[PDB]
């Protein structure tokens, strides 16, 4: 008969979209770790996943934020956020030179390109902080195969009244089209981000909540117009988890090339820890972007939908829904007449409805769902999947 144990065949698959647990820091603004350097206090990015397509837009400036910081006799707006390019061994470095530099390190040579750039950037200690937690974030350019170290950690200065409606340094994180190939990397990004973190958007799929043997719609979502996946991915990046809290003195520090003043600029001396509107379902037909702040725990198979996260690439789409996930797991749980608590499959007979299974019209896998069964869990408010009262004590 039916198992009484609950089972989610999506648990492993869905781990990388649990941004609170896998990333654990701000997405739009990442300033989740504190660091002291020579008795000054800094905030620095700490998320463990990369952010594909993120850069810093400097308003009223055509200069790319990957240009080195502007010090000396130039204005702040003439430069960007990157390390001054004075030393070929520090920043920036091409993949080819990264590979040569660490050719004799076996572990380094096992890293993928992105993790190699992160490890190079994050491994640098400043000669005067050898005991400090401060390590610089990096931007890896996948098109140019180039690793840029960021000299300062600030990501947003849009607040001060001087940033409200031209000759002042105002900037914000964004997924500008110029940034499409860029990867934003804190010091903590996992070397196995490809297995553990979001990257590609999920085609023929929308995020759902697993409720006792079937993937269900997220009831509380916010609808936003979006012309395409890119716009939906940008919208949810603007709404995602954020850690964000005299200009003339700041400009004097840059002119004077003052390390403390530059690196602490635009940071006021809290932490999202990954919580926010991090996920979105994109209706490709109705041109709608449905963002939500609840961790998803499964995917619904829908040919009209693409599932995106704030961390995901702006446009890469993996189209192959895992159609065998239910059938494989039902066979896996049979090894434990004990039939698992899974009421969806592409094999009709593998479920054994007390009635006739219903085909999902937008299922590319031709999934059938058994809705004529006792359900032992439900969705409370704020998208909270809770065990029903009749079984709460029993579980």
């Amino acid at each position, epitope marked *: 008969e039916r198992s009484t144990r609950m089972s989610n065949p999506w648990k492993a698959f869905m781990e990388k979209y649990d941004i609170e647990r896998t990333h654990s820091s701000g997405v739009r603004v990442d300033l989740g770790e504190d660091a002291e350097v020579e008795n*000054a206090k800094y905030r620095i990015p700490a998320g463990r996943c990369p952010v594909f397509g993120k850069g810093i837009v400097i308003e009223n400036s055509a200069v790319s934020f990957l240009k080195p910081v502007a010090t*000396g*006799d130039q204005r702040l707006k003439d430069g960007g956020f990157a390390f*001054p390019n004075a*030393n070929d*061994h520090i920043s920036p470095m091409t993949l080819e030179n990264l590979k040569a530099r660490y050719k004799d390190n076996v572990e380094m040579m096992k890293l993928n390109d992105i993790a190699l750039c992160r490890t190079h950037a994050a491994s640098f200690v400043m000669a005067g902080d050898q005991n400090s937690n401060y390590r610089h974030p990096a931007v890896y350019d996948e098109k140019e195969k180039t690793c840029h170290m960021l000299y300062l950690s600030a990501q947003e200065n849009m607040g001060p009244r001087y940033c409200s409606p031209d000759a002042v340094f105002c900037f914000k994180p964004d997924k500008d089209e110029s940034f499409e190939n860029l990867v934003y990397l804190s010091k903590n990004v996992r070397n196995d981000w490809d297995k553990k973190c979001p990257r590609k958007n999920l085609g023929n799929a929308k995020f759902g909540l697993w409720v006792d043997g079937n993937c269900e719609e997220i009831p509380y979502v916010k609808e936003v117009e979006a012309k395409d996946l890119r716009e939906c991915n940008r919208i949810v990046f603007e709404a995602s988890a954020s850690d964000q809290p005299d200009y003339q003195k700041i400009q004097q520090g840059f002119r004077q090339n003052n390390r403390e003043m530059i690196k602490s600029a635009f940071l006021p001396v809290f932490k999202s820890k990954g919580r926010g509107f991090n996920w979105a379902n994109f209706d490709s037909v109705k041109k709608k972007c449905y963002i939500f702040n609840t961790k998803p725990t499964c995917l619904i198979n829908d040919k009209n939908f693409i599932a995106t996260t704030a961390l995901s690439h702006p446009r890469e789409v993996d189209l192959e829904f895992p159609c065998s996930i239910y059938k494989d797991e039902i066979e896996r749980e049979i090894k434990k007449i004990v039939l698992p608590r899974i009421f969806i499959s592409n094999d009709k007979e593998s479920i054994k409805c007390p009635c006739e299974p219903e085909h999902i019209s937008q299922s590319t896998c031709n999934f059938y769902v058994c809705n004529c069964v006792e359900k032992r869990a439900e969705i409370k408010e704020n998208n909270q999947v809770v065990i029903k009262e009749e079984f709460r004590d029993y579980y």
Partner: antibody, heavy 131, light 110 residues
Framework: QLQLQESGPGLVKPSETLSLTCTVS??????????WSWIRQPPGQGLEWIGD???????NQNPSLKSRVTTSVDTATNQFSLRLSSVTAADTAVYFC???????????????????????WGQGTLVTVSS | EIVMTQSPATLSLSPGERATLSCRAS??????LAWYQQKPGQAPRLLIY???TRASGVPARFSGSGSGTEFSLTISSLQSEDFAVYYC???????????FGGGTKVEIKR
């Protein structure tokens, strides 16, 4: 208002120790990112860096003078000093004290310089080695 | 050590003319290079760091360029007050082991 002042010019006898002090005003020698160094210039000649001192207490020296060079810093009086022992006529020079914008980065057992330039100098003090 | 060689030894030009001063490294030093101007009886004054970053307060007619082993300082329009000895200085290794070039004397024709 940063200004550096070397101690006054004078004589040092051969084989004895040259002693100089630099007095920093309009700023603190306890300033991260900045080292305080000595650079010298024999008459009619070029520039030679001697060594520095950092406010935490560490010091780099020109490897060809290391055995004869001692620097020190007084965080209370905002001064730093130079001691060059066993001087010969080859040490007759104008001695500048200077603020050095310093920044190095180290990974995997090797350090690499980002900045080590001299943005503010004293006036120079002529030291003559003579009997 | 890394040796810095400056060329020419002396430069004689007229006000308003473009002066190009050369500094070569015995060994590749990326862009860890500074330029200084020393007037008679005065201490050197910082012009450029990172090979091309002009220091705060330096007139715009001074500029530097180059990488690796070849470097230049350019005075786009020589002024009569630009008479000085100009020095380059590398600082590539850490712990610092800086060295200077031998200097280029810029004299004004009249």
């Amino acid at each position: 208002q940063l200004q550096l002042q070397e101690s006054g010019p004078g004589l040092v006898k051969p084989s004895e120790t040259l002693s100089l002090t630099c007095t920093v005003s309009g700023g603190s020698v306890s300033s991260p990112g900045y080292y305080w160094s000595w650079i010298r210039q024999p008459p009619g000649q070029g520039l030679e860096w001697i060594g520095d001192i950092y406010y935490r207490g560490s010091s780099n020296q020109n490897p060809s003078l290391k055995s004869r060079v001692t620097t020190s810093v007084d965080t209370a009086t905002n001064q730093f000093s130079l001691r060059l022992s066993s001087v010969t006529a080859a040490d007759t020079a104008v001695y500048f004290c200077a603020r050095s914008r310093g920044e190095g980065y180290c990974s995997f057992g090797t350090c690499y310089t980002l900045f080590y330039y001299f943005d503010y100098w004293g006036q120079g003090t002529l030291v003559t080695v003579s009997s | 050590e890394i040796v810095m060689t400056q060329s020419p030894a002396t430069l004689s030009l007229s006000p308003g003319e473009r002066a190009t001063l050369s500094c070569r490294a015995s060994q590749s030093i990326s862009k860890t290079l500074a330029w200084y101007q020393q007037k008679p009886g005065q201490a050197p004054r910082l012009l450029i760091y990172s090979a091309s970053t002009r220091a705060s307060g330096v007139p715009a007619r001074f500029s530097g360029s180059g990488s690796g082993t070849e470097f230049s300082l350019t005075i786009s329009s020589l002024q009569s007050e630009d008479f000085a000895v100009y020095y380059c200085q590398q600082y590539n290794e850490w712990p610092p082991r800086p060295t200077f070039g031998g200097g280029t004397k810029v004299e004004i024709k009249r």
